[PDB]
Amino acid sequence: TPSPALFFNTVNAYQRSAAIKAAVELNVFTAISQGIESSQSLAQKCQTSERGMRMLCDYLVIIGFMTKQAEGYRLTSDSAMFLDRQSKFYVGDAIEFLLSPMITNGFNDLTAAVLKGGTAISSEGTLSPEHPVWVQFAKAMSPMMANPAQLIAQLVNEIEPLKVLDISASHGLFGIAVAQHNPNAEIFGVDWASVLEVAKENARIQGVASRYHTIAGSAFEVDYGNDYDLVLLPNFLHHFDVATCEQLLRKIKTALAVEGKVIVFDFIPNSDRITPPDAAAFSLVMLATTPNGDAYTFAEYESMFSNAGFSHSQLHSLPTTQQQVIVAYK
Amino acid sequence: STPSPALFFNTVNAYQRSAAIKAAVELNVFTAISQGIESSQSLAQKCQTSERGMRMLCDYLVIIGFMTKQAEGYRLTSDSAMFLDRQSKFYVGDAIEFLLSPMITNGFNDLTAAVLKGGTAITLSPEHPVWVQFAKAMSPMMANPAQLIAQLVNEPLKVLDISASHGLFGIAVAQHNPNAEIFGVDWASVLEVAKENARIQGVASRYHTIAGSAFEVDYGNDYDLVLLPNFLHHFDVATCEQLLRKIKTALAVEGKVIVFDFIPNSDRITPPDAAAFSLVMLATTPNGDAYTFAEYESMFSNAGFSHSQLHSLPTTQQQVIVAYK
Ligand SMILES: [Cl-]
Ligand SMILES: [Cl-]
């Protein structure tokens, strides 16, 4: 039988976002933790009205974050692991970036973006110089990037760099992990100055500050230097049109040493542009927030590297992690 | 088995799905595809948008399940062909005029404040104009329930329809009962949608209106049937009880009240759409709720009614209570 349920669930999907934002901001999951709490008790613990807590928690049960037992609400394993502040795997503060109005405003008029072919946000959306949303990204999103940074590092350890450039270093964890596994590596991070403050702090925390160097400014304007064994591009290229990525890849080529390598870490959808769903859905994010950005397929990236003068590019799917890697060879 | 933050991240970004379906309806994408197959280039030309914008939106709409992507272009699912193509008799797309009204989405923009307060941080203002939008935009999905309730009651009647809105509940009683006289109660501006619908359905000579607040106007007397579609949920129990006392007075000796509303099981988590409606009440009203049958039963009892009885109606989304004077 045919049904308008998808339509209506989709129309009202914004409510789920608001519900999880409230839950996180109010520490609801931390208050429940691995036990069972009534809404009356969560009201006391989180300092809210009881009826408000009850209506929120019933909804959180309805959409899958918790269960409702006789004696109260209980987290699912996933909420206990990822949303309870007591857990080492807590990612709940990612909303500081993901639900930043600096990001969500692009979706306030997606019709406008579809009409014009890119972000309806004033200027160049999130690509304006030193946009503060990238400080929020660097602070808020680093927990989920820790593991892939380590994976890329141990994929690099099969190569041995002495000189590393990390372009849009952000939190700095990709270059920092290279430094962690390679005692003779010197790391150069390129980002806006206020973002590199985070990267530096993370290098400090990780014990590699003395081998961590910064080149503040636009990846397109700064002088990188040269003789780089390894150039990392984590979650950068998707923001720009193809010509701009090509401009960047030529600059990178000049800076590489003889046997130099570029590692791209990004959302790389299959050629269908609909799978994997999370990778492929990122193209709407690029429409909403950037003028000409896209979630580019491997074939598209292979062609950019080919046109920028590289000899060979190769996909490493990395099934253990959400995003995908391309290694290019000078 | 293996734990995942996927539910968390997909819930966090869920607002994006609402944005995409809003753009698609506003741009008339589903009407442009219809029951055929159209490339993103063709659709950009038909809808007067950029090619890349259309491609990116359509790929996203394929991902979340509204259409498929074939070799030669995009193709609707049956559900989209049925409900989102304007050419279909069952088109419901313009429901977003109410559902994505700022007058509802603003409430969720400060849901955290609502939870702390116990009620809306910002609909029940005298003559709020979002109710003219509800009446125009939400009527297509109420057409079938209205016919079912008219089926359920139908055996010279005097009917009161309280918060008549689009007027379809009362109108359907008159559609099926040619000697029924209908008295719609809502704000004057909302009643003009009701009257337009009365006329369209050919029942206008037997459609009458009492303009103003359901809580202040004078209903008259000797009502066989009183309809309460989608209204009690906005108010607290005491305010509901007040209205039901006022209703009781207006009823003839063997008079019945029919409530059509979101009535969740006593778990307050099923059925999912009924149960989740209480968050919408938190976000948008000071003291509204999705009340359960026990709660409505108690309200009618305290208001002096002899009896109330549930009719789930599984052939629809919402549930029905009949109360007896
Ligand atoms: Cl990153
Ligand atoms: Cl209604």
Side-chain angles (χ1 to χ4, degrees), chain A residues 1-43 45-73 75-87 89-121 123-158 160-220 222-226 228-258 260-330, chain B residues 1-16 18-44 46-71 73-88 90-96 98-124 126-132 134-150 152-215 217-314 316-325:
Chain A
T1 71
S3 176
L6 184 55
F7 174 57
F8 287 117
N9 297 331
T10 306
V11 173
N12 294 340
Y14 73 93
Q15 295 172 0
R16 298 182 139 102
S17 300
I20 200 56
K21 179 177 177 163
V24 167
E25 291 182 340
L26 292 175
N27 276 10
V28 176
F29 308 106
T30 301
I32 300 166
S33 191
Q34 307 207 359
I36 294 169
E37 296 299 337
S38 63
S39 54
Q40 292 84 352
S41 148
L42 294 171
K45 304 263 222 222
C46 305
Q47 295 169 315
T48 71
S49 68
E50 186 270 333
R51 74 194 297 285
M53 186 60 65
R54 179 263 298 176
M55 295 154 108
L56 184 61
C57 290
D58 287 336
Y59 189 90
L60 293 173
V61 171
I62 298 167
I63 76 178
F65 290 92
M66 58 190 62
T67 61
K68 201 179 176 166
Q69 307 304 312
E71 303 296 330
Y73 300 100
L75 298 194
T76 64
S77 306
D78 290 335
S79 297
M81 186 174 173
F82 295 108
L83 294 175
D84 180 356
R85 286 184 183 283
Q86 154 58 17
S87 173
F89 303 99
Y90 177 75
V91 289
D93 295 345
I95 65 165
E96 285 173 13
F97 172 79
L98 293 170
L99 297 190
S100 173
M102 304 184 266
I103 294 304
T104 68
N105 283 352
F107 289 89
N108 287 348
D109 207 348
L110 200 53
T111 305
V114 174
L115 274 174
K116 75 178 277 186
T119 189
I121 296 165
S123 305
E124 300 184 293
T126 57
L127 305 200
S128 61
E130 308 184 292
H131 197 298
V133 80
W134 303 119
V135 180
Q136 284 310 298
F137 185 98
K139 297 188 193 309
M141 301 289 287
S142 69
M144 297 88 71
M145 296 312 166
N147 180 59
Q150 294 299 316
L151 298 173
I152 287 176
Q154 66 202 153
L155 167 71
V156 154
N157 276 11
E158 300 156 334
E160 198 217 308
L162 304 194
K163 206 176 169 181
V164 184
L165 188 64
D166 197 350
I167 297 171
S168 64
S170 176
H171 42 79
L173 297 190
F174 292 92
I176 288 156
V178 173
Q180 160 194 342
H181 297 297
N182 300 277
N184 308 305
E186 296 283 331
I187 315 303
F188 295 76
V190 179
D191 215 313
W192 307 113
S194 63
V195 176
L196 293 166
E197 290 305 317
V198 184
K200 267 147 70 198
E201 186 48 24
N202 284 327
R204 221 263 293 142
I205 293 167
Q206 294 300 311
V208 307
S210 67
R211 305 195 274 123
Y212 200 83
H213 317 288
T214 70
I215 302 170
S218 167
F220 302 97
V222 301
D223 302 323
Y224 297 163
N226 41 52
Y228 287 96
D229 301 309
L230 176 61
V231 182
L232 316 185
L233 285 159
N235 287 303
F236 198 49
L237 287 184
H238 55 232
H239 297 110
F240 312 103
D241 58 39
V242 167
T244 306
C245 293
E246 285 180 347
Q247 189 189 126
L248 191 77
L249 296 179
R250 278 183 293 262
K251 182 173 184 171
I252 290 171
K253 195 194 179 190
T254 306
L256 284 167
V258 171
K261 270 157 242 181
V262 181
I263 301 193
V264 177
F265 174 80
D266 219 306
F267 290 104
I268 310 167
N270 299 325
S271 61
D272 59 9
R273 301 196 102 91
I274 60 170
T275 55
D278 54 12
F282 196 73
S283 90
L284 200 75
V285 179
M286 296 295 88
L287 176 69
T289 65
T290 74
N292 324 295
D294 206 349
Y296 291 115
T297 63
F298 172 67
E300 280 172 322
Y301 279 141
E302 181 171 51
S303 168
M304 291 181 232
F305 277 107
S306 169
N307 292 349
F310 291 74
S311 89
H312 178 55
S313 37
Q314 185 158 293
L315 192 56
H316 300 245
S317 150
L318 283 204
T320 46
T321 195
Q322 167 185 29
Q323 314 192 228
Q324 296 80 30
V325 164
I326 294 168
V327 180
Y329 299 82
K330 203 193 187 176
Chain B
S1 209
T2 51
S4 192
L7 183 60
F8 169 62
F9 291 117
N10 298 334
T11 306
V12 167
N13 286 336
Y15 71 92
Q16 298 180 348
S18 301
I21 195 60
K22 184 181 192 202
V25 172
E26 287 181 343
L27 290 168
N28 255 252
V29 175
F30 307 97
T31 302
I33 299 162
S34 200
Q35 310 198 1
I37 301 161
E38 301 295 335
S39 67
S40 54
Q41 187 65 238
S42 175
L43 289 174
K46 284 161 158 246
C47 300
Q48 307 164 125
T49 79
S50 68
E51 187 287 332
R52 70 193 301 277
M54 187 56 71
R55 176 270 287 181
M56 297 157 96
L57 180 66
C58 289
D59 287 340
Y60 187 86
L61 295 176
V62 176
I63 298 164
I64 65 173
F66 286 94
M67 53 187 65
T68 68
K69 188 168 179 179
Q70 306 304 315
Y74 303 91
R75 185 160 198 285
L76 295 188
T77 64
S78 284
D79 293 339
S80 289
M82 177 129 296
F83 297 106
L84 296 169
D85 176 358
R86 293 182 182 277
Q87 177 205 258
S88 174
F90 306 97
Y91 173 81
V92 289
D94 290 351
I96 65 168
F98 176 76
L99 295 173
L100 297 174
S101 186
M103 304 306 211
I104 302 315
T105 60
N106 291 353
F108 285 91
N109 287 325
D110 43 31
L111 192 56
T112 309
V115 171
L116 292 152
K117 185 187 224 319
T120 179
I122 306 309
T123 45
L124 315 185
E127 205 144 11
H128 199 313
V130 76
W131 301 120
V132 180
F134 183 99
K136 294 175 150 157
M138 301 294 275
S139 72
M141 301 89 67
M142 301 306 165
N144 184 55
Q147 294 292 305
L148 300 182
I149 296 167
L152 182 64
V153 309
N154 177 31
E155 306 156 302
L157 277 182
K158 201 210 189 182
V159 191
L160 194 60
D161 189 2
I162 294 172
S163 77
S165 187
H166 42 79
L168 293 186
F169 289 92
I171 287 160
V173 174
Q175 223 141 37
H176 298 340
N177 303 236
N179 292 127
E181 300 284 318
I182 318 297
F183 289 78
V185 172
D186 216 318
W187 305 106
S189 42
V190 184
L191 285 166
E192 290 297 326
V193 186
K195 292 163 71 193
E196 177 61 25
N197 283 328
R199 283 193 290 271
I200 287 163
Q201 300 300 316
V203 309
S205 59
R206 304 182 279 127
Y207 201 86
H208 322 276
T209 50
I210 310 163
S213 164
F215 295 90
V217 306
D218 292 316
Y219 298 155
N221 287 87
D222 302 311
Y223 285 104
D224 302 318
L225 188 52
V226 172
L227 310 170
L228 278 172
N230 281 308
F231 191 62
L232 298 177
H233 61 231
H234 301 106
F235 313 104
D236 61 16
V237 306
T239 302
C240 290
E241 284 173 351
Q242 175 186 131
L243 189 73
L244 292 176
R245 288 188 259 266
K246 177 173 170 142
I247 289 160
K248 194 190 166 184
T249 303
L251 287 167
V253 164
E254 229 73 53
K256 289 156 212 71
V257 183
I258 301 183
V259 166
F260 175 78
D261 218 296
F262 295 105
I263 307 153
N265 302 322
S266 64
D267 66 5
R268 296 204 192 256
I269 57 162
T270 54
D273 293 347
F277 191 76
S278 84
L279 199 71
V280 184
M281 287 301 91
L282 179 74
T284 66
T285 63
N287 294 298
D289 203 351
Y291 296 113
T292 63
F293 179 69
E295 296 173 306
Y296 281 133
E297 200 179 28
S298 167
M299 284 179 227
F300 277 105
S301 181
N302 301 351
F305 285 72
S306 52
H307 191 57
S308 48
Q309 196 154 290
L310 207 57
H311 309 51
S312 153
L313 274 186
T316 75
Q317 191 207 359
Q318 308 190 227
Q319 304 83 14
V320 156
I321 296 176
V322 178
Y324 303 93
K325 198 184 176 174

